[PDB]
Structure formats: structure tokens, C-alpha cells
Design a protein around this ligand. Structure first.
Ligand code: CU
Ligand code: CU
Ligand code: CU
Ligand code: CU
Length: 325
């Protein structure tokens, strides 16, 4: 069973371009420093991190919705706002990139969550800005595909996960889109034999980024359904290296972030408001988790700037290939 949208391999020139950062460096770091703050649900810093996401994307002429909602926590009802930015709201199908912008409320002290998920958030804003010229151009093709970015709120648990206790942003959004009904008829250029009953069916694939920014991550294909998309990330990282475009510690080394292994079978319970609704998922999360995971050392000084820049190359080339930029 084939992926519904045919592949067009990234043009060599684009590969070469996506691959050489050319300060960009400063744009990315400046964007990241906005996220290197505690991002606790309901706090003022949190709210301002939202306002920053919202402004940045509006500044690029994207449509931006704040899906703001209350949810029952174990610390009383709390307010939450997801941010959905869609490049071309009319386009039937969406390549969706997502991450959460809340930081874990940490029993021990101030938790910055540099990898979890400040870097992912920054990488999303950074992708949007950096590919803006090609993205604004692709938007008017009328081809029925667009890019969409979801910054979820309230994903991080408060307790020892009672199945009632986390994923506030994803449970809410997933439901909202599952219940908001539509059809190929009301949308722009759906694929020929696609079945659209509701907004969630418009998520063509959801690419979720987590726990990025530590040195030498290892990823695997966590879903057989997305295995054709996952392979594009493998192939892109391979071309980048071939072309000598990765930053390595020494000459004649290669990055091997994206394992070509057969699909693994890990517990995938936290995507699930999405999986029960059949949204295909690529989870870009390392296995094993970074050593800093949920420690107060998940900070700015523990980020591996060369890994981060290499990943940024992979993500830009990947977006570019998928949208045929
Ligand atoms: Cu080009
Ligand atoms: Cu997280
Ligand atoms: Cu976490
Ligand atoms: Cu996963």
C-alpha cells in the first residue's frame, strides 16, 4: 500500500543550498533564546512565549489560530492555548509539523526544557522563516497541499500519568478536528481518491519533533504506516553527508541519526488522540532519550549546536522535498 502522494526526490541544487547554513545561524539562535525560559502552564512567561510564536508566524503572512480551552488537571481547572498556523488554510491536505511549547513543572526547581521542547519549537519557526520565499511561492500553485505547524500546549504531565492527567492540547485538538465535519467538495484540490469526512482527515502526515538538541540522537521508524516518509529523512541525511554538508567533530565522519532499521515496536500511547483517529505519524524523537531528559540539566549550555544545525538541514530539505519546493 503506497503513500497517497508521489515522491519527487529533492533537486541536487536544493540539497546543496539547504545544506550550507550561511548566518541563518543568528536568526536561529535569536529565535531559540526566546524559548529558553520556564514555560509553565498558565504563567506569564508561557503566555509571552505564545505571543512570540503567534507574532512570528503572522509576520510571515500565515493564518494563525489560538485554540484556547480549559482542562481538568489535578491542580484544578487550568487554561491552555494551542497555536495552529496554516500557510494556505484552503489547501485540502496539510503536511503538519508539531511540538509542544509548555515546559514540565519540575518537582526539584526551575526546568528550562531546552531539548524538551525549546529547540523543537525554535526549529519550527526557523523552518517557516528560512523557507518563506519558496513556501509563499508553493502556496499559490493550487495543488491542494500546504504546510501547517501545531505548537501544542499542556502536553507534559503533572503526576504519575493517570490516563486522565496529560496531553491536554492534543486530546482537545484531536477531538475538535475529528468533530468538525467537511468533505472534498468544500476544499481545494483534494487528491483524487481521498476520503475527507472531517478536519482531521486533512492531516496528511503529522511530523512530531521532541527531545532534540543533545548530541548524537538515534531515531528509528516508530510507525510502519509512515515508513515511506521516514525513509526520505534517512535518504536526505545520507545525501547531506555524501555532499560533505554535516558538521562532524573530525574529518571523514558521518552522522547516522536516522536508523535504516526495520520499524521498531515501542509503546506509542501518547499519540493516540491522533492514532485512534487514523492520523499517520512520524515521531522524530530519540531512542534512548537524551541523558538530560527531565533533569534540571536540560538547559542552554547542554545543547549541541552542531547536531542542531545538522538536524535543521535535514528538516529543511525534508520539508522542501515533501512540498516540492
Ligand atoms: Cu531550488
Ligand atoms: Cu516534551
Ligand atoms: Cu518531557
Ligand atoms: Cu512516538
Amino acid at each position: 500500500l503506497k503513500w497517497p502522494r508521489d515522491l519527487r526526490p529533492l533537486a541536487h541544487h536544493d540539497l546543496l543550498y539547504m545544506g550550507q547554513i550561511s548566518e541563518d545561524r543568528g536568526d536561529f539562535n535569536a529565535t531559540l533564546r526566546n524559548f529558553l525560559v520556564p514555560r509553565v502552564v498558565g504563567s506569564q512567561k508561557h503566555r509571552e512565549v505564545r505571543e512570540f510564536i503567534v507574532r512570528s508566524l503572522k509576520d510571515l503572512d500565515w493564518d494563525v489560530e489560538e485554540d484556547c480551552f480549559d482542562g481538568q488537571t489535578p491542580h484544578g481547572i487550568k487554561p491552555f492555548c494551542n497555536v495552529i498556523a496554516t500557510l494556505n488554510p484552503s489547501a485540502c491536505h496539510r503536511l503538519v509539523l508539531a511540538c509542544h511549547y509548555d515546559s514540565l513543572l519540575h518537582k526539584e526547581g526551575t526546568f528550562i526544557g531546552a531539548t524538551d521542547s525549546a529547540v523543537p519549537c525554535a526549529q519550527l519557526l526557523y523552518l517557516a522563516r528560512s523557507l518563506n520565499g519558496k513556501l509563499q511561492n508553493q502556496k499559490t500553485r493550487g495543488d491542494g497541499l500546504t504546510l501547517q505547524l501545531v505548537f501544542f500546549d499542556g502536553e507534559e504531565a503533572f503526576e504519575r500519568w493517570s490516563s486522565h492527567d496529560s496531553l491536554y492540547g492534543s486530546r482537545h485538538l484531536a477531538q475538535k478536528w475529528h468533530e468538525d465535519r467537511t468533505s472534498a467538495e468544500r476544499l481545494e484540490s483534494c487528491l483524487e481518491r481521498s476520503e475527507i469526512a472531517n478536519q482531521i482527515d486533512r492531516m496528511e502526515v503529522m511530523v512530531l519533533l521532541d527531545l532534540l538538541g543533545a548530541e548524537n540522537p538515534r531515531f528509528y521508524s516508530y510507525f510502519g504506516e509512515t515508513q515511506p516518509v521516514y525513509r526520505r529523512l534517512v535518504n536526505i541525511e545520507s545525501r547531506l553527508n555524501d555532499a560533505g554538508l554535516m558538521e562532524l567533530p573530525r574529518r571523514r565522519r558521518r552522522t547516522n541519526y536516522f536508523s535504516n532499521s526495520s520499524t521498531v515496536g515501542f509503546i506509542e500511547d501518547d499519540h493516540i488522540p491522533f492514532l485512534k483517529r487514523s492520523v499517520p505519524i512520524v515521531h522524530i524523537i530519540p531512542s534512548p532519550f537524551p541523558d538530560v531528559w527531565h533533569t534540571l540539566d536540560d538547559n542552554e549550555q547542554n545543547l549541541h549546536h552542531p547536531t542542531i544545525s545538522n538536524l535543521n538541514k535535514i528538516f529543511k530539505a525534508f520539508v522542501s522535498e515533501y512540498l516540492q519546493l
